[PDB]
Design a protein around this ligand. Structure first.
Ligand SMILES: OC[C@H]1O[C@@H](O[C@H]2[C@H](O)[C@@H](O)[C@H](O[C@H]3[C@H](O)[C@@H](O)[C@H](O[C@H]4[C@H](O)[C@@H](O)[C@H](O)O[C@@H]4CO)O[C@@H]3CO)O[C@@H]2CO)[C@H](O)[C@@H](O)[C@@H]1O
Ligand SMILES: O=S([O-])[O-]
Ligand SMILES: [Cl-]
Ligand SMILES: [Cl-]
Length: 416
């Protein structure tokens, strides 16, 4: 007997860690779990091709923001039974519960696996050298910009690179997601989409969304993000932070784990950044404090030939033992609320900051059209980063680009 599972790179050795996670299950049931690791860049294509073709695994990892879209194609097995066996609605943060289904759908189609949310890594040595108190820098938009100005004026040089650090690293290539931009949209009192009388519309071109997006993109145009960074993607910016080229960088809790792993094993423990590593929440914007809260769920294709066994594996991977173990392996947080209280998560001072930041966590709505909405948004946001790189992003040009984005998004949303 065989189960196939598709996962994304959640840990330093994704396949080996997942095999070690499921070895007790394999023994107890007399079964082999075969795993295939999909890059996040190609996962959507691979998963939607399995969905329409009927050729795929028994289980796939799904990003929380994708559950609605894949569920709407009618290809996922109901898993309300698994969720009831895991403790039902009360066993999960409501934000997590809402990712188990397409908004407004009758049955659940995904089991929560892990949660993640975004905060700022910072170089503790660089902020001390600049005279920046992270408590002031990360409290407010004004404190954020004031600390980036101090980091820009700093005479600090990395002790390995013998070079200055960039104040902020953020990618300017066409993003794959709005994860980096969302907290600035939200902090200004904006939204990506808004429901009015049942129907979803873009709000990327609202005055509030434009204020937040402009604030964020203009940090790079004011010189706090180097030119080189706007020609880089997330993976390259992450490597730059790890190699000691950036003072401040937004990411998920996984990087805490990677900071404790040797380079040999796909970590960065030997690097100065790992030994001078701090974490602070996103600053409060004028309409409050938000950060992106996501993670990944597991779903069972309705064409699987091993549904009963597959659901046993969903109950295993969703349950307390596997939930704590996999969070430990990945640096992610458990999707199961009770597992947050495990003392292993409360003892890393950096992870404790992620946990506290979850009070301001915000999710995308679970829409059928989400894949197309985010794809359309990031294509237009890619062009606004192109203007930034030329010093030509004006409020007017950003409004023009978000009006186009909003037309495209409203036209896609009318197709559901
Ligand atoms: O949008 C869909 C989905 O996104 C989820 O967020 C994902 C990001 O999409 C993804 O790009 C990000 O990828 C991380 C990966 O998790 C890490 O393991 C990896 O970390 C190491 C890695 O071990 C090495 O192999 C790699 O080469 O280098 C890095 C350096 O430390 O870093 C990548 C790149 O950022 O992971 C996110 C979390 O899963 C949301 O969570 C979800 O809600 C969305 O639906
Ligand atoms: O940053 S100035 O263009 O508002
Ligand atoms: Cl961005
Ligand atoms: Cl939103």
């Amino acid at each position: 007997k065989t189960l196939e599972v598709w996962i994304m790179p959640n840990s330093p050795q994704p396949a080996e860690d997942f095999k070690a996670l499921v070895a007790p299950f394999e023994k107890a049931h007399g079964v082999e779990v075969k795993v295939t690791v999909l890059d996040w860049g190609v996962a959507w294509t691979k998963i939607t091709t399995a969905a329409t073709s009927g050729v795929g695994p028994d289980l796939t990892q799904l990003g929380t923001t994708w559950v609605g879209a894949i569920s709407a194609m009618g290809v996922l097995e109901p898993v309300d039974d698994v969720l009831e066996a895991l403790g039902g609605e009360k066993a999960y943060l409501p934000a997590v519960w809402r990712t188990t289904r397409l908004e407004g759908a009758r049955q659940a189609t995904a089991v929560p696996w892990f949660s993640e949310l975004r905060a700022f890594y910072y170089r503790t040595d660089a902020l001390k050298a600049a005279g920046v108190n992270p408590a002031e820098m990360f409290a407010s938009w004004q404190g954020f910009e004031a600390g980036l100005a101090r980091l820009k004026a700093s005479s600090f040089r990395d002790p390995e690179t013998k070079a200055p650090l960039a104040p902020l690293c953020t990618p300017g290539r066409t993003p794959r997601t709005l994860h980096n931009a969302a907290p600035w949209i939200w902090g200004a009192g904006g939204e990506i989409v808004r429901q009015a009388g049942g129907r979803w519309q873009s709000a990327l071109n609202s005055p509030e969304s434009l204020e937040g997006l402009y604030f964020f993109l203009s940090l790079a145009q004011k010189g706090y993000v180097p030119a080189e960074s706007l020609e880089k993607n997330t993976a390259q910016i992450e490597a730059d932070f790890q190699a000691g080229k950036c003072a401040v960088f937004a990411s998920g809790p996984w990087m805490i784990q990677r900071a404790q792993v040797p380079e040999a094993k796909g970590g960065f423990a030997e690097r100065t950044a790992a030994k001078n590593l701090g974490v602070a929440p996103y600053p409060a914007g004028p309409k409050g404090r938000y950060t992106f809260f996501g993670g990944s769920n597991l779903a069972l294709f309705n064409f699987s030939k091993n549904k009963p066994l597959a659901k046993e594996l969903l109950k295993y991977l969703g349950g307390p033992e596997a939930q704590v173990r996999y969070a430990q392996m990945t640096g992610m947080l458990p999707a199961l609320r009770s597992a947050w209280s495990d003392p292993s998560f409360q003892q890393n001072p950096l992870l404790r900051t992620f946990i506290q930041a979850a009070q301001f966590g915000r999710t995308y709505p679970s829409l059928a059209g989400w894949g197309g909405v985010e794809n359309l948004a990031v294509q237009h946001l890619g062009m606004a980063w192109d203007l930034v790189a030329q010093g030509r992003l004006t409020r007017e040009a950003l409004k023009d680009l978000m009006d186009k984005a909003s037309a495209a998004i409203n036209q896609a949303l009318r197709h559901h």
